[PDB]
Symmetry: C5
Subunit: 346 residues, 5 copies
C-alpha cells in the first residue's frame, strides 16, 4: 500500500477533479460546519479599551464528499500543515476581532484529519483580543457579559451554515482562574445572523458571564473611606477650644477624601453615568464635609455669648454637639443598609 | 457545465488577453469606483497622539467589461481570496493612515463577486488608526470632527474617480457605543481632490461628528472644585482668634486647588491656548486665594486697635467679614451664569 | 567523494522515497523524541499579566531510520537551515505560549545534524512569554512556581512521545541572575499528558521555583510603615495642652498611613484575598489610628474636671497616658513576633 | 498597438538585455538621483526617547537610458507596483531610521512612471521614526532642530549621487499643525557626505526648525509657582502671635514647592545640565524658603525681650517685618526682569 | 566583456560547482571571519528590563577561494541584495539578542562586495535590544559595563572562528551622545568561547563602559533632601511655646521625607540590596526624625517644672536646645564627608 501522503495526492491532485476553491455539495444544500472551542487562557480584561484576550483551540467539522475514500485501510488520514492550502476550508472570522494572530512555533499549530466517509476535523490555535462593551453602572458588583461571535465572510446562508455541536460546545481548561473575575459555568449559546446589503451571513455566538471579585475593592477603597468618616466623628469629643485642631481635623480629612474620590477612578473608562463606587465616595464625602459645617454651627453659636442669654448660649452649644455624637453614627448606618441591600437585589 | 473556478480561469487566464495590470476602459473614460464603509468598531480616541482607531468593511464597486460573461448560467461568481492577484483592483489608500493592517484569521477576510454585465463587488476588512487634529478650545463641551479620506495613489483623475454611493454611503453597526463620545447620525460627505506636482488624484471623505459626554468631567472635576471654594466660605463664620485655623483653612484649600488644577490636564496634549476647563480651575483658584487675602485684611485691620479709635477698629473688622459672607457667594454665582451660558451658546 | 549537500539530496530527494510528511517508524512503534532546554535569559516576571519571558535553546533528539547512511566517511552531516523544510520534525508547541517567536538575525538560528545510525539533533532558539498563575497569599515571602510544558499538536500518544533526557534536562547559563527572584537549583520534571476529545497528546513539563528577595520590600514598605507607628508614640510625651499638635500628630500620621496602604498595591493584580503585606499595613493602620482615639479618651476624661473629683479627673488623665507609653510599644512587639514567625513557618 | 504592460515586458524582459541589478550608465558617470519629500503627518515628538515620527511621500527621479522608447505613442507609462522588482532602483535609506515601514493597505503604496527619454519618477509612502538629539538647555524657550538624512547604502560617490531638486525640495501639507511646536517655513538643505572605511557614500539632509509653544508651560508651571511665592508674602501681615500659622504657612508652601519642582521634570530626559525651568523653580524655591527664615529672625529677635532694651526688642521686630513687605516683592521682580530678558536674547 | 551580474552567475551558477550550503575550505582549516561594528545610535538604557537598544553596521570579512576570478578586469564586484541567498555567509548571532530586526526601507540594507583573491566584505544594518545585568550598588555613581557578544550558531570551533580586526574593531559615530551616560573611549575586546553539550562555538565580545551623569540626580534628589533637613534645623530657634508649630514642623517635614524616600525608586528595578541613594535618603530620614524626638525631650523636660528645682528645669531645657543648634549641623556635615569620599574612592 502506498503511504497516505502519496494517497492524499491522489484524492486532491490534478487528477480526480478536486478543486480547493469550490465548496462541498456545490449547487446543492449548504455546508453544515459544526464548531466548538477550547479556552486555554483567558483574561487581561481591560476596561479603558473594553477588550479581553482569549487563547482558544478552534475546532471545525464538516463533510466533504469528494474526500471519501474506500481503498486505504485505516480509518483516518492526517495532513501535514504544509498541505493545508489544498483542501476547502470555511472562511470563519470573528466579528469583534480587534486584532488576532495564529501560532507558528516549531510548526504551524494546525490539525487536520479526514475520516472514511469524508468527515473533516480541522483544529487551529488562535489568540484573540475580543471587544466587549462594559456596563459599569454598579461597578464593584456588576456581572459583565462579554461575547465572541463566529461568522462567515464570503459565503452566504444558502451556501454555508455554522452550528454549535451538542457535545459540549465550549470547553474550558482544568485550572483556568482569573485574578479579578470568576467565569460562571453556564455559557449561553445563540444565533447572531447578520444582514448586510451584500447578503445574509451565518453567525453563532457564545456568551461568557464574568462576575467580579468584590474582595479587592472592599480592601482598597470601601474600608479606607469608612475610616476617614470615623475620623470626622472623633472631632466631636474634642471641646470647642482647640479650634486649630477641630478645623484642622475638618480639613485634612475632607481633602484626603477628595484624593480617595479622585483616586477611585484612576484606571477606568470616562463614562458619563454615575456608578456604585461614585455614590459611595460622594456620600462619604458628604459626611466628612458635614462634620466641618457642624463645627461652624458650634463656633458661631457660642460666639454670640444681660446675664442669662450669655449663659444660655454656652449650654446650647453643648447640646448640638451631643446630637452629632449619635445622629452621624446613625444616619451613616442607615446609608450602609440602603447601599448594600440596593446592590444585592440587583 | 464546468465549475466557476475553471470558468474564471477562462475569463482571466493567458487566453482571452486579460491582464490584471491594465485598468478597465483603457485609453477611454475613467473608471468610476463607488465606495461605502461599514463601521464595526470605533473608539480608543486618544488626544495625546490625536488619533482614533476604526474597524471597517470597505466595499468597492466598479465595472470591468472584460469580465462580462454570457455562457455560465448563474448571475454571480465568487472568487477564492487566493485568486485576488489576478483581477484589476483600485489602489485605494487612506491619506491619514498612521498605520493600518488587514485581517487574516482562518482565511483572508476578502470578498469578491462578479455579475454578468461585469459589475465587480470587492469587500475587505481593515483596521485603521486614523489621524484627526483636535480643537480643544472648549474642552468638556466641544464637538470634535474627525475625518477619513480615501484616495487613489497611482491613477490620476483622468483614469480613476472615487464616488460615494447614494444608498447609504456610511453604515454603522447596531449597538455601536462609545465610552466618552456620542456619534451623531448626520455624517458629512464631500470631495477632497488633491493636487500634487505628480498630478491630480481623486479623493472622497467622510466627516464624523463626535460630541463628548460632559457627565464624566462634571463628576471628577467640576464638583470637587466647587466644594473647595465652599471650604473657603466656612472660614468666615470662624472668629478672628483661631488664626492657626483660618490661615490653615486658607492654605490647605489653596494648595489642594493647585493639585486639582495640575491634575486637570494629566492626560491631555500640551496645547498653547487656554481651554474651558482651565478658566474654571484658574477662576476657582482665585476664589480660594482671595479668601486668604480677605483674612489678611482682617488680621491687620484689627491689629491697629485714645479710646474710641481702638474700639472703632474692632467693629470695622466685624463689618468686612459680613460682606464676604454675601459677596463671595454672589460673585461666584455670577461666574456660574457667565460660564455655562458662554459654553452653551457655542 | 561528493560533498554532503549533494549527499543529503540523495538521502532526501525524490529518489529513495523519503517523504517529510511521514514520521519515522510509520505504522509501528511511536517516535521517542527526547528534549532538553538551555535558558539564556529569564525574567521580566510581571504579575498584572501573570507571565514571564524566557529565552531558550530547545534541543530535540529522535531517530529516523530513513536517514541512516553507510557510504559517506564522516560521522555527522550538518544541514543548511535553508533545507529544514525537507526532513520530518516534531510538531512541538508550548501549552502556555501567550505569544512567541523565532530569531532570524543574520541566519535562521536553527541547528540540525544527522549521525550515521539516524540520530537527528535539532536545536533552535525561541523567545517565549509563558503564562503562570501567581499565588500571592503571602506576598513578599512567597515561593512562586512557574512552569513550561511541551506538547505535541497533531500526533497522538500512539505516534509520538516526548521525554526529558536524563543527562541534565534543564541547563541554566553561567551568570543568570534575577533582580527580584532567585531561581532554585532543583527543577521538578514530570508528565502532563493531556486528554482532549480529539485524542490523548504527549506532554512533559518543567517546574521553576522562584523565591522572592524580601530585601526590597523590607526597605520601601516595612521600615517606613514601622516609623509612622513610632510617630504615634511620640504623641504621648506631649502634654494635654497642645491639642492642635497631638491631634495634628494624630491626623497627619493616620492619613499618610492611608497613602502607604494604598501605595502598597500600586503595581499588583487586583486579587480577591488578603495578602501578607495587607495584614501588615492594616494592623499598622490600627496602631496609628488607636493613638488618636487614645487622645480623645484623654481630652474628654479631663474635660469633666465639689473639690476632690475635679482634682481626681486631672490625675486620672495622667495615668491613662502612662499605660500607653508601655502598652502600645508592647502590643506592637507581640504583633512583630506573631507576624514574622507566622510567615517563616510557611 | 500592444498595451503598455505587454510593452514594458519588451523593454525589461529577457530580450533587449535589461538587467535590474546593474545601474544606468554603467562604467560611466554616476547616476544623478534627485529627491523631494512631502510631509503628510508630523509629530509625537518624544524627548525621553529623543525621536519624532514623520509620514512622508518620498519622490525620486533619475535617468535610465535603457528605458528610453520611441515606438509607443503616449508620453508616460505606469508600472504596476507588482512589477517593481524588475527595474533598477536606488538603495536609499535613512541614517537615523530607528525603525520604519512601508504602507500596504489595499495595494502597495508605490508609484512608478517612465517618460520617453528615460526619466523615471518613483514615489513611495514611508512612516519614519527619526532620531534627533534634543538641546534642552533653555527648555520652554528652545528652538529644536531635528533633521532627516538620505543616504546610499551600497553605491559609493563615484556611482550614485543624491541631490535635492530646486523646485521646492520639501513640501508640507495644507493644514499640518503641531500640538506643542510650530514648524518654521525656512528649511535648511545641505550635504552630509559620509566617509567610512568601506568608501564614501552620498548623503543629503533637511533641517526642520521646531520652536515650542510657551503657552502651555506658562499656565501649568510658571503661574502656579508664581502664586506660591505670593503665599509667602501674606505671612508678613500676620502678627508674631500666630506662630502655628506663620510657621504653618512657612512649611505648607515650602513643601508644596518641592512637589512643583519635582513635578516639573516628570516626563523629561534625565539630563546632566541645569535648564531654564530648573532655575525658575529653584529660585522660587528660595523665596518660599527665605520667608520661613525671615520669621525665625523675628521669633528669635523678640524672644530676647532693664526696661528700655526689653522695649527696644519689641519695636526691632516691627521693623524687620516692614522691610520684607517691600524687599521680597522687589527682589522677586528684579529676578522677573533678569530671567525673561535672559531667555529672550537667546 | 559581459556585465558583472552575468559574470557572478558564472561564478555561482549551477556550473563551476559552487554551493552556498558548503563553507570555504571544506574539510580543511577553519574559516577566519573578522568583524567590526559601527554604532549609529545607542541608548534607551532601561533598568526595569535591564536592556539597551543599539543600532549598528555589522561588517564581516572572510575568504572564499571559490569566488576568486581572474578574467574580469575590475578589482571588486558588488552583488545585488536580491542575490544574497546564493553565497555562503556566516551564521553569526548575538548571545544576548532579546529581540532584533533588520532594516528594509526602499531596499534591503545589505552590502556585499567580492575582491579578486576572494575576499568578501559583507555589511548589514541591525537594530539590537541587548541584555546587560545592572550592578546598582552605588547607584548615581556607578560605572555600568554592558556587553555585546557575537557567536556562531551551527559551526563549531574547528569550522569557523570569529576575530576582531586590529584596525579599529568598534567605531562610534561623530556626535553620538547619551542623555544619562557617557560612553568611555576605551572599549575592551576579549573572547567568550562557549562550551555546550553540542560542541564548542566561537564567540567574541565588546565591553562598553557607561558612566552616569550625576548632575541630574544631584538636582532632583540630593538637594531637595538637603533642604528638608535644614527645615528641621529652623525648629530650634522657635521657643517652646509654639507646640502646634514645632510639632507641625516635626511632622510635615518627616512625612514629606517619606515621599522623597519612596519617590527615589519610582522607576528602578526591585533590587534586594541597599544602594547609595538609599543610604542618603534613610540617613536624611534620621535627621528629620531625630529633630522631632529632640522636641519631645524638651517639652517633657520642662513639663516637670520647692522653688529651685522648678527654676532648674526651665534653664535645663534652654541648654538642650543650644547643643542641637550646633550638633545637628555638625553631625550632618561629618556624614557629608563620609558619604562623598566613600563613593569617590570607588
Ligand atoms: C444542512 O443542515 C440543514 C438543516 O439546517 C439541512 O437543510 C434541510 O434539509 C432537509 C433534507 O434533510 C430539507 O428537506 C426537508 O425534508 C423534510 C423531511 O425530513 C421535509 O418534510 C421538508 O418538507 C423538507 O423537504 C430541508 O428543506 C432543508 N432546510 C433548509 C432550511 O435548507 C441541509 O440539508 C443540510 N445539508 C447537508 C449537506 O447536510
Ligand atoms: C464615469 O463617470 C463620469 C461622470 O463623472 C463620466 O464622465 C462623463 O461621461 C459623459 C458621457 O456619458 C461625457 O459626455 C457628455 O455627455 C453629455 C450627454 O449626456 C453631453 O451633453 C456632454 O457635452 C458630454 O459630451 C462627459 O464628458 C464625461 N465627463 C467627464 C468629466 O469625463 C464617465 O463617462 C464615466 N465612465 C464610465 C466608464 O462609466
Ligand atoms: C519508544 O519508547 C517506548 C517506551 O516508552 C517503547 O515502547 C515499548 O517497546 C517495547 C519493545 O522494546 C514493547 O515491547 C515490550 O517488550 C518487553 C521486553 O523488553 C516485553 O516483556 C513486553 O511484554 C513488551 O512486549 C513495549 O510494549 C512498548 N511499550 C509501549 C507502551 O509502547 C517503543 O518501542 C520505543 N519506540 C522506538 C521506535 O524506539
Ligand atoms: C551627474 O551630475 C554630475 C555633476 O554633479 C556630472 O558630473 C560632471 O559632468 C561633466 C560633464 O557634463 C564632467 O566634465 C566637465 O565638463 C566641463 C564642461 O562642462 C569641463 O570644463 C570640465 O573640465 C569637465 O570635463 C565633470 O567632470 C563631472 N564632474 C564630476 C565631479 O563627476 C555627471 O556627468 C552627471 N551624470 C549624468 C549621468 O548625468
Ligand atoms: C585561520 O586562522 C588560524 C589561526 O587562528 C589558522 O590556524 C593555524 O594555521 C597554521 C598554518 O598557518 C597551522 O600550522 C602551524 O604552522 C606553524 C608555522 O607557521 C607551525 O610551526 C605549527 O607547528 C603549525 O603546524 C596551525 O596549526 C593552525 N592552528 C590552529 C589552532 O588551527 C588557520 O590556518 C587559518 N585558516 C585559514 C583558512 O586562513
Amino acid at each position: 500500500p502506498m503511504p497516505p501522503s502519496e494517497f492524499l495526492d491522489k484524492l486532491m491532485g490534478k487528477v480526480s477533479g478536486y478543486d480547493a476553491r469550490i465548496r462541498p455539495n456545490f449547487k446543492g444544500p449548504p455546508v453544515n460546519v459544526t464548531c466548538n472551542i477550547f479556552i486555554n487562557s483567558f483574561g487581561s480584561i481591560a476596561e479603558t479599551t473594553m477588550d479581553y484576550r482569549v487563547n482558544i483551540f478552534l475546532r471545525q467539522q464538516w463533510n466533504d464528499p469528494r474526500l471519501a475514500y474506500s481503498e486505504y485501510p485505516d480509518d483516518s488520514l492526517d495532513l501535514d500543515p504544509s498541505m493545508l492550502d489544498s483542501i476547502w476550508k470555511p472562511d470563519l472570522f470573528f466579528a469583534n476581532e480587534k486584532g488576532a494572530n495564529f501560532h507558528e512555533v516549531t510548526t504551524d499549530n494546525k490539525l487536520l484529519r479526514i475520516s472514511k466517509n469524508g468527515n473533516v476535523l480541522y483544529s487551529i490555535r488562535i489568540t484573540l483580543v475580543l471587544a466587549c462593551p462594559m456596563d459599569l453602572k454598579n461597578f464593584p458588583m456588576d456581572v459583565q457579559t462579554c461575547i465572541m461571535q463566529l461568522e462567515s465572510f464570503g459565503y452566504t446562508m444558502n451556501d454555508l451554515i455554522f452550528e454549535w455541536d451538542e457535545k459540549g460546545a465550549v470547553q474550558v481548561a482544568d485550572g483556568l482562574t482569573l485574578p479579578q473575575f470568576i467565569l460562571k459555568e453556564e455559557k449561553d449559546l445563540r444565533y447572531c445572523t447578520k444582514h448586510y446589503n451584500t447578503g445574509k451571513f451565518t453567525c453563532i455566538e457564545a456568551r461568557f458571564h464574568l462576575e467580579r471579585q468584590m474582595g479587592y475593592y472592599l480592601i482598597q477603597m470601601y474600608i479606607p473611606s469608612l475610616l476617614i468618616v470615623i475620623l470626622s466623628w472623633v472631632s466631636f469629643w474634642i471641646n470647642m477650644d482647640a479650634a486649630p485642631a477641630r478645623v484642622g481635623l475638618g480639613i485634612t480629612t475632607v481633602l484626603t477624601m477628595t484624593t480617595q474620590s479622585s483616586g477611585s477612578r484612576a484606571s477606568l473608562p470616562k463614562v458619563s453615568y454615575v456608578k456604585a463606587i461614585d455614590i459611595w465616595m460622594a456620600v462619604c464625602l458628604l459626611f466628612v464635609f458635614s462634620a466641618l459645617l457642624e463645627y461652624a454651627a458650634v463656633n458661631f453659636i457660642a460666639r454670640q455669648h444681660v446675664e442669662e442669654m450669655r449663659k444660655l448660649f454656652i449650654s446650647r452649644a453643648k447640646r448640638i454637639d451631643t446630637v452629632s455624637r449619635v445622629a452621624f453614627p446613625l444616619v451613616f448606618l442607615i446609608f450602609n443598609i440602603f447601599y448594600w441591600i440596593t446592590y444585592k437585589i440587583i
